[model samples]
Target: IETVPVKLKPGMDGPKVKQWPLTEEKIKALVEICTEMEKEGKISKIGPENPYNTPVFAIKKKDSTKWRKLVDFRELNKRTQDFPHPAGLKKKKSVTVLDVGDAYFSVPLDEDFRKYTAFTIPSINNETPGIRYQYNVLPQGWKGSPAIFQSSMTKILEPFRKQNPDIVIYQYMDDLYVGSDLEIGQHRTKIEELRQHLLRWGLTTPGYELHPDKWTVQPIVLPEKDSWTVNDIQKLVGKLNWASQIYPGIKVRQLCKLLRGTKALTEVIPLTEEAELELAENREILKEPVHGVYYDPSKDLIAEIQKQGQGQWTYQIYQEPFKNLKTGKYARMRGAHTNDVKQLTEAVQKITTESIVIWGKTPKFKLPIQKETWETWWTEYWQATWIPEWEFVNTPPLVKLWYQLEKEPIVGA
Candidate 1:
């Protein structure tokens, strides 16, 4: 089942957009203009590269008190205080913090392309740098840089905290967290006020917006009668994983090693029939004594199926029988062009989603590459350290394993 995600503003792209820099006055003028345009239903939206990094004015409410600050958890954490790790965190408490706000909404890039084109930064990567080019991190040799741009945005938010001390605004860089309730018009007002506050502080609300009616996703449900069972899922997706990429033939073998004798965690159960089947047929899915892991790529598989075109592949990708969780509709299994790197990459991604990626607690962030690439990067001092020559080339594949995070006595290899 899919629950409609709560959002402060519909159509918020995930963390990656840059912040726009502008004096408090110019931004207020922009907000005034956008607000007018919005009232008249004239503003246009495209995607993550909305206007600038500052979110279009959006806010939430709590007990009739409007909060000017929304999700600024990171900034607050950085600026507020540094306490020792919380007590619960020390105990390995199951922390489930939900980030609830900002839905991804699209605003046409062409509409504001010229404005972005004018936003200046450092170098050549300034394709429509706009205001956002300044606020985020740049990889290097990048023009329309991030450092200055991001600083501008944080400056805009600075006023909200200073003036509205009661608004528990938590901000770390750009990520924000404001505690409030789910009220409609009340929340809308809170957001508008923040926009107003931003305007007074010389920051502009992005021109992009999310119309809740169109942008929000509704909860999804699948009927038991229409669902595919574990066995059915296994028939299609069970043995198709290929982590090594170079040798796909080893997938079935690798799977065998992970499942042949797995111990049971009686408290857990697979959520879907297809998922269950994936666990089952792969190796007598119940109460089996197994350790380590078997990986799968369901997301990429779905994306491939979705990518089917007339001349895309010889066979019809995705047909009836395989059901989608969102639509409860069945389609043909997607045909494969497994040889293509692009196609294969997508398949890998899907497998990643279906089977949780297990990273070791001390996950390996860097993997070794050929001598040529390493030499260039090393000379630039871009790398911390070269991979040890004695290290097992392909052995420590999985990073800090997720499942082993809390396990005691996990013998090191």
Candidate 2:
């Protein structure tokens, strides 16, 4: 493992701070955790004479009996130099998601900078001042920890990436997604090679093992109950919202409506018929598998804008000749929605420079004022030439026929 040195801001020195009070149970856990970390050489006990000190606390791990020890490095972080790092897997026959055990701890900290990450834990007896300990590795809660770890991982994987250019490895700090579009045997071989490479670097993958079953949407089982609290609804909404990113067909709009004007998370509310219906629909949608869609620049681009209700509008951009993975049929690549035409236009242009087939009704505007507003917009922003065959559907047939004619004849004739 490469050693990551903490870079401080100009004229900044290590922080000397006092420890925060913790409950007896937490203090006991802290001592045990510190002992374990010390045994692993992740941290070391320091003398009281040390110049730097920071508060430490323990938080219960979610759905587990374990506790996560955290150092309050806010003061040190404020005085440290910022290190920003570049910040998804879509289509694959087989995928292996490997999470690095003790991700930040894998990278060793420079000896000179270790003192800056020191924290003191209160004695179990509560009679004397606590023992001080400093991290020998990149500590959590530091502003530059993620960037530092990401930089180290990137450098470590660069050689392997160059050697095997065909293998796809998508890494976001500690989590690595190894994907292969080939057969199962080939995928396993690539994953084993990666594991060996990581092993050579002293990095261990112990959490959230391989996901072999690809192109499948797992069903979200909601709690079986007659009534639900605001907290339950919020949690369900959050889960579905995350799933919607992968499966665009899962609609959560109606489910989200139930959360409006929610006073308290624990406040129980009677389940409405609309919410119940939406829940069922979303579950049904998730039962089927949906293959991921990749954006193709060569395909024909179609932009559709619809007036939702009143001033509100929704827009979607689609790439033609693209298959709807869920339905397995040729369909539009349903993009995203926005309220205003200007934003919609900006979003469309950002995605592609190709000519767009405007496939919806012309937005209605106030007689003279708004009409001129749109005219100004067209003259300034509308640079691409319009394809005559792709005229707006809202246009009258006779008017369209007149425009389609090559020669300009008398209107009365």
- TM-score winner: 2
lDDT of 1 at 88: 19
Model 2 has a clash total of 0
Q: Kindly list the per-residue Cα lDDT of model 1 for residues 292-408, writing each as its tens digit.
A: 322222222121122222213111112121221111111123553332323322332222222111110111112223444433222211111111111112312221121111122
Segments in model 1 whose C-alpha atoms lie over 4 Å from true places? 1-146, 149-155, 162-182, 207-234, 237-413
- Global CA lDDT of candidate 2, please? 0.56
Backbone collision count in every prediction? 76, 0
Highest lDDT against the true fold, candidate: 2
**TM per prediction:** 0.24, 0.40
lDDT of each: 0.27, 0.56
lDDT digits (tens) for residues 55-161 of candidate 2: 77776532446766766566887788866111122444555655553567867877888878888888755798787888888776565666677766777778878
- Looking at candidate 1, the ten consecutive residues that score lowest on lDDT are 383-392
